Amino acid sequence: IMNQEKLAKLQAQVRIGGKGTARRKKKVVHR
Amino acid sequence: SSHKTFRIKRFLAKKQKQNRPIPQWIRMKTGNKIRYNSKRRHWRRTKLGL
Amino acid sequence: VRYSLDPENPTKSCKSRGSNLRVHFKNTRETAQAIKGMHIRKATKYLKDVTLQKQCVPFRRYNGGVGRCAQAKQWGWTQGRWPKKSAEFLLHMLKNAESNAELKGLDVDSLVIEHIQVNKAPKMRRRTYRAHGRINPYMSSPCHIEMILTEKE
Amino acid sequence: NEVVTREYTINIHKRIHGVGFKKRAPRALKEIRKFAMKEMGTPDVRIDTRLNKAVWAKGIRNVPYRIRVRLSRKRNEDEDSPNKLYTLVTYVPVTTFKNLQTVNVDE
Amino acid sequence: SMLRLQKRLASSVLRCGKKKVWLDPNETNEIANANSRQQIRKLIKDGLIIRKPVTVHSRARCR
RNA sequence: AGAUCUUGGUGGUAGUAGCAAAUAUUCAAACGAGAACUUUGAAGGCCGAAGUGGAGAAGGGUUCCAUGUGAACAGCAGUUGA
Ligand SMILES: [Mg+2]
Ligand SMILES: [Mg+2]
Ligand SMILES: [Mg+2]
Ligand SMILES: [Mg+2]
Ligand SMILES: [Mg+2]
Ligand SMILES: [Mg+2]
Ligand SMILES: [Mg+2]
Ligand SMILES: [Mg+2]
Ligand SMILES: [Mg+2]
Ligand SMILES: [Mg+2]
Ligand SMILES: [Mg+2]
């Protein structure tokens, strides 16, 4: 479940550019 | 070119096959006196007479 | 191997050598003449300063067209430069000589460069293309370097 | 302390005056690096990508006249380089530059 | 290390240009293991390779 | 000792001329002994569909594609490469 630290790092993990760029949707590590 | 005749293709095949370095063990033969392959050809340096 | 100027006592001496090194002979000769006679620590510091453009080597014999600098005044001279490649090659040869001294068992804090010599090496040939269908040489001028360090305090 | 962070404003206009059009934005970052080196005494200066983008915001020749930066001197414990301290400089967006002093900032 | 091959393969799989291929700068080591187009498809599914959107060329000014 | 002699080698010139046609690069990171030049990301630009785009004919002939090397070559460099 989400929490404050989880969202705080999610904000950095989602942006992959500046204004006008598409936010990252997903990131999985799977075997 | 992409369009080529059989004779041209065979000539190019022989040139490609014979453009390779000498085997390493040749230099170990008795009275060898061959250091490298002096007949090496690069496609950009020297063009085939054909 | 045959060095010129064999040391007077080859028990307090160490040697270093390099052949066919791809640095300019003139720049290397000037750098060698600059570091000749120095302590090994002083020579290391000076070569690092030459790399950092804080001290210069004075170009005394091969100085045709070499510009002037303010750092050339410490030397009794006017024209100086900062040959980075020559400084790096001489630093590597100095490290090799220091390692040889450690192997021989003589302490490196007293080593002084008593002999250094830069010889011309066989020239490597390349090509340059000129105005009217002409070909001219574009040769390299590599050098052999040898050095003998001794202990003296 | 040696892990201090401070906030400065740089007169990029003053430092970039006279430079040609295609060299203004690169030399603005060279001058920012020089400013950080002089003010924090660390040859290792790393510029945040957001700060680089802010300097390059209006193209290569119309660099912003003033920039508000934050110099954070940090311990370079990441590796055994000769520089044990580095300075990370980051962009601080502002609305006005009037009456802004050099101020120390906490964590 | 060097992801020249992976960007070329991702462009063919995504059927876009190399302009639009986004390789995750943090997961460089994982993408470098993808030497086949099947591996590229797996990375595309897992979000390590992304097709960046078309640059906005609005017609609102002309309208 | 000569022949603007023949062949080969080597100097001064000289670390000199020069490496100035087509607007332009920058930040961070990875690998690596080593990064102005490799790769990835973020910016800023250029070609602007009569293209610096996508495909062919002639010609080339394996330059195609992976992996590896870092001698020589790519008139600086290179961890890159026809
Ligand atoms: Mg040709
Ligand atoms: Mg002159
Ligand atoms: Mg020419
Ligand atoms: Mg011609
Ligand atoms: Mg004669
Ligand atoms: Mg010159
Ligand atoms: Mg010039
Ligand atoms: Mg345009
Ligand atoms: Mg075309
Ligand atoms: Mg290829
Ligand atoms: Mg080169």
Side-chain angles (χ1 to χ4, degrees), chain B residues 11-24:
Chain B
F11 167 85
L12 299 169
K14 168 169 180 148
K15 290 289 179 174
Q16 161 174 338
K17 288 196 283 191
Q18 72 181 30
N19 184 41
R20 41 150 291 171
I22 68 167
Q24 180 77 258

Side-chain angles (χ1 to χ4, degrees), chain C residues 75-92:
Chain C
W75 301 96
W77 187 258
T78 307
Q79 279 161 296
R81 267 188 189 167
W82 301 266
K84 207 193 77 145
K85 211 189 251 193
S86 306
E88 295 304 323
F89 274 53
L90 290 186
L91 275 163
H92 207 259

Side-chain angles (χ1 to χ4, degrees), chain C residues 5-13 114 148-152:
Chain C
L5 273 71
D6 50 3
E8 58 269 7
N9 55 4
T11 311
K12 304 199 289 180
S13 298
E114 74 169 2
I148 298 175
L149 320 187
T150 44
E151 288 181 324
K152 44 166 72 171

Side-chain angles (χ1 to χ4, degrees), chain B residues 4-47:
Chain B
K4 48 178 68 71
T5 70
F6 182 78
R7 288 176 200 166
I8 298 321
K9 186 161 169 212
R10 194 176 50 170
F11 167 85
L12 299 169
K14 168 169 180 148
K15 290 289 179 174
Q16 161 174 338
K17 288 196 283 191
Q18 72 181 30
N19 184 41
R20 41 150 291 171
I22 68 167
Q24 180 77 258
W25 44 275
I26 296 286
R27 303 224 303 287
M28 302 298 296
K29 299 190 103 148
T30 295
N32 173 223
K33 215 67 181 183
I34 290 189
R35 285 85 185 276
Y36 52 92
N37 188 14
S38 79
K39 304 214 183 162
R40 286 307 290 287
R41 172 198 49 96
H42 197 252
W43 55 275
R44 224 167 188 192
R45 275 69 168 266
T46 302
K47 296 304 200 180

